[PDB]
Amino acid sequence: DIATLSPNEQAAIDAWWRAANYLSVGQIYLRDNPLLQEPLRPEHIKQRLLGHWGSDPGLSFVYVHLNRLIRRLDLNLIYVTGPGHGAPALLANAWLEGTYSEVYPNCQQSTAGLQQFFKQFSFPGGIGSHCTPETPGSIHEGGELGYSLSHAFGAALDNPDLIVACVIGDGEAETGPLATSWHSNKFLNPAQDGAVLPILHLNGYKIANPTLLSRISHEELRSLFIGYGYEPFFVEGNDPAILHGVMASTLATCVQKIQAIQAAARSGESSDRPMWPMIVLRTPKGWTGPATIKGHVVEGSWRSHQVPMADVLTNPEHLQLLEDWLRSYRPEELFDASGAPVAELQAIAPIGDRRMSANPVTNGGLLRRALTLPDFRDQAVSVPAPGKSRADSTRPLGQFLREVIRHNPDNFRLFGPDETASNRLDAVYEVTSKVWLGDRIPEDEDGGHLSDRGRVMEILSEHTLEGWLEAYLLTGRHGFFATYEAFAHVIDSMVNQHAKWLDVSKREVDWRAPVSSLNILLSSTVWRQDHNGFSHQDPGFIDLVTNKSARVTRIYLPPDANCLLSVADHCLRSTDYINVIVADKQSHLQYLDAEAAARHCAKGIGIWDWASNDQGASPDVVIASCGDVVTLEALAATALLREHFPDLKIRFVNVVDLFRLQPDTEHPHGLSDRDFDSLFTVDKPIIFNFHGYPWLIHKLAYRRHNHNNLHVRGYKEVGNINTPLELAIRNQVDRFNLAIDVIDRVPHLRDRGAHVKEWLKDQIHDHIQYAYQEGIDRPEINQWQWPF
């Protein structure tokens, strides 16, 4: 009897459906007189109309039907909204369920509450027109389109009984990120994870053009969505009397198959990739609004996308049409005198946490358990002498991540775009593998590292991975993203969205608990260009992240493996941040042991006393580095200067936290003027060697008292192919150019260092000539060790 729809139940569901639309339209238009007790007047209409209408009925259409199956089958559901402009529909149902009144006591279920509820939407000092963090039961802001689908899969991970109902607009489906995220079914495990129920809201139109997926034939539509690995179900029409029963049956069909798929997998009898059920919903745009405006068809057309009538404040004719639109919902039979929904509506409202707007998963910070972090000092490489030993920088991190996975079998995950092996993090493969539910071959047994139980997820689409991870954190869990720095620009749009979400959730919204940080590891830099990656890779992603703020993003550039461990250990505890860690996978020198590394990362920036020779004296120059390749060149330059200028006093400063350079006025995390003057003196030149665009340092540290003595060398440009030393020579960040820069800046070396400066230019000439002759650097360059 679950598939069939009772006429009595059909009426109450239809009653809820119209009331949700009525509240949605009231939010768009009304600022006063919520229930039409008195004739509508221009003083009740909002001056500026920013809400969108063409998607609201469809979202409410599915939402009321989703609540039906929760009441019947006791399903645990989440609502993820593709078109973020359909916010009124979600809020209206949130208010109808009673969630919004509990979260916001001002907007009660009354006439006075409705006046506040209607006036707040898309209003200065109110709430936005998208699924902002202020929305109860919202994890995804659909303002930027293409990421709703991935967030459904991310939230589904390690939530076996959860079902995430993600509604997808046809226009959104034309975007690149969402077209590739359909293949996320291959990495979702039916045994341990929940289900995603994709609903294609094929209203037929974008803002102003028809959606191609609508204008592509039905046969090719089913062909496209079986090739994605889904079992597609089609509900088409325009008359709700037929569509109420038809749609209810389809949703009943889908849930049984989802449970049948999960029952088959968890029993172990069918350990294969299943054909997940997906719904294709073709309904008119602006479904229950005006039919035509000014002789142009509006309903079921792109003209209904935002607002069918935007001149209602001007001419009374549309004003009467607006009031006629509102009364078509028959609000008199939907709300009582007080302003609450009628008891028929309250009957079909789910109860407590079973409500999709009050599910604690959406406010994931309440479901967040801190990771049991093993002591990273067990994985710290031994550094008996600083800078005299070489070890692979990322491998200790891989071993540390291995022990985190061991102690957090479900709460932690790894995400990587087919680069985990290249990034040299294979230590995690010793305890787990990579997720794969596609076809398997015996050749995968040797080094495939493929298993459905794996805690590491791999796909070449960087958009898919970022959406997977962001949803995983917002549901109250932990993760770590590792990728090349060359392709970081691909996810720049997605990072902005998540940073937006975190910043609002901290300051504006008070009831949203903190979630875990977004930890990103840019594992291959632009200085050590390996085989893969384009020639002109740029560090520009770092500039984009620092663009957001110091109070939501953190940038770490640890010099060695022990600093990488301390940084990763520190950032696996921080909550409301986007942590971007820039480290290189090549074999590098090691500088700090576990104790010294931990103190260094706690400060974020500090003097290296072994690399300095200014103890108990005023340094003639401060050499600072931020990175690992540039740190090596800065250290090598320091060694050269001390050989040729024994009396020269050099203070070596290494900075790991980029944002420490900002003054404490901008953010509390930054250094004070006294602290900054202690590290970098008030009047001596600073030769800063930065892994990135040099101006980023100037943007951060322009307010310092010694900024006029700050001289930053960083990434400028590249040739087609360069050796590691030649590439550093092109950007003037190599050891020889840095030594020349120190000679130019130190006042008592311009006259005295001329002969050394000529010798340094000779070395630049010799190494370039050798590079063009052999294709690599000289052995003494590759095996350079810290002297002294």
Ligand X SMILES: Cc1ncc(C[n+]2csc(CCOP(=O)(O)OP(=O)(O)O)c2C)c(N)n1
By CB under 6 A, name the binding residues for ligand X: 54-55, 83, 85, 144-145, 169-172, 175, 201, 203, 206-207, 211, 285, 305, 532
Binding characters for its own copies, 511-550, by CB under 8 A (x = yes): x-xx----------------xxxxxx-x-x--xx--x---
266 binds ligand ANP (CB under 6 A): no
As beta bridge partners, residue 604 has none
694 binds ligand ANP (CB under 6 A): yes
712 binds, among ligand X, ligand ANP, Mg ion, none (CB under 5 to 8 A by kind): ligand ANP
Pick from 34, 57, 86, 171 the residue near Mg ion by CB under 5 A: 171
**Element at 492 (helix H, strand E):** helix 492-507
**Element at 547 (helix H, strand E):** helix 540-548
DSSP letters of 770-786? HHHHHSS--HHHHT---
- 349 class by beta-carbon count within 10 Å (0-12 exposed, 13-18 middle, 19+ buried): middle
Binding characters for its own copies, 478-507, by CB under 8 A (x = yes): ------------------xx--x---x---
The residue among 570 and 711 lying less far from ligand ANP, judged by its C-beta, is: 711
Q: Which of residues 706-725 bind ligand ANP (CB under 6 A)?
A: 711-712
Q: How far apart are CA 553 and CA 577, in angstroms?
A: 5
Pick from 266, 327, 330, 699 the residue near its own copies by CB under 8 A: 699
Stretch that binds Mg ion, among 154-162, 163-171, 478-486, 627-635 (CB under 5 A): 163-171
First to last CA, the chain: 84
The residue among 128 and 177 lying less far from its own copies, judged by its C-beta, is: 128
Cβ at position 657, least distance to ligand ANP in Å: 18
The residue among 352 and 384 lying less far from its own copies, judged by its C-beta, is: 352
The residue among 511 and 702 lying less far from ligand ANP, judged by its C-beta, is: 702
CB 56 within 8 A of CB 89: yes
Give rounded-to-5 percent helix, strand, coil for the chain: 45, 15, 45
- Which among 147, 146, 122, 154 has a CA at the least distance from the CA of 24? 122
750 binds ligand ANP (CB under 6 A): no
The residue among 29 and 335 lying less far from ligand X, judged by its C-beta, is: 29
The residue among 31 and 244 lying less far from its own copies, judged by its C-beta, is: 31
Distant-in-sequence, close-in-space partners of 439: CB < 8 Å, separation ≥ 6: none
Sign of CA dihedral 296, 300, 302, 305: positive
Q: Which of residues 11-70 bind its own copies (CB under 8 A)?
A: 31, 46-52
510 binds its own copies (CB under 8 A): yes
726 binds its own copies (CB under 8 A): yes
Where do the H-state alpha helices sit in 35-157? 56-73, 87-97, 99-103, 111-120, 148-156
Q: Which of residues 573-602 bind its own copies (CB under 8 A)?
A: 599, 602
Distant-in-sequence, close-in-space partners of 381: CB < 8 Å, separation ≥ 6: 389, 391, 396, 561, 562, 590
Cβ at position 491, least distance to ligand X in Å: 15
702 binds ligand ANP (CB under 6 A): yes
Q: How far apart are CA 80 and CA 66, in angstroms?
A: 12
The residue among 448 and 514 lying less far from its own copies, judged by its C-beta, is: 514
CB 593 within 8 A of CB 576: no
The residue among 136 and 694 lying less far from ligand ANP, judged by its C-beta, is: 694
CB 303 within 8 A of CB 293: yes
**AA identity, residue 57:** P
351 binds its own copies (CB under 8 A): no
The residue among 55 and 399 lying less far from ligand X, judged by its C-beta, is: 55
Binding site for Mg ion (CB under 5 A): 169-171, 203, 205
